[PDB]
């Protein structure tokens, strides 16, 4: 029921036990040196 303004799509492959690291505060090998999300994120995370 909405319309979206500035849409971007990221994409990568990791290992299962690291999916929990894709979030605002996670401080791990993936969130520290590889990929980090803001603390005021607006969007959706999707894994499979």
């Amino acid at each position: 029921d909405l319309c979206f303004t500035n849409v971007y799509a990221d994409s990568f492959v990791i290992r299962g036990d690291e999916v929990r690291q894709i979030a605002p505060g996670q401080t791990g090998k993936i969130a520290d040196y590889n990929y980090k999300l803001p603390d005021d994120f607006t969007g959706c995370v999707i894994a499979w």
Partner: protein, 49 residues
């Protein structure tokens, strides 16, 4: 000796250890360890350093 031991206790006789006089640089675990569940309760994990 903790995460890389040889035998762990039985949950009915769980073990308990004491840690003192050491440096907590957990970044040594990134190379070999892989945790599926990690949750801190009374502290934010971005301030464990």
């Amino acid at each position: 000796e903790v995460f890389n031991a040889t035998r762990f206790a039985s949950v009915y006789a769980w073990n308990r250890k004491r840690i003192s006089n050491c440096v907590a640089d957990y970044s040594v675990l990134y190379n070999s360890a892989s945790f599926s569940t990690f949750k801190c309760y009374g502290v934010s994990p971005t301030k464990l350093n």
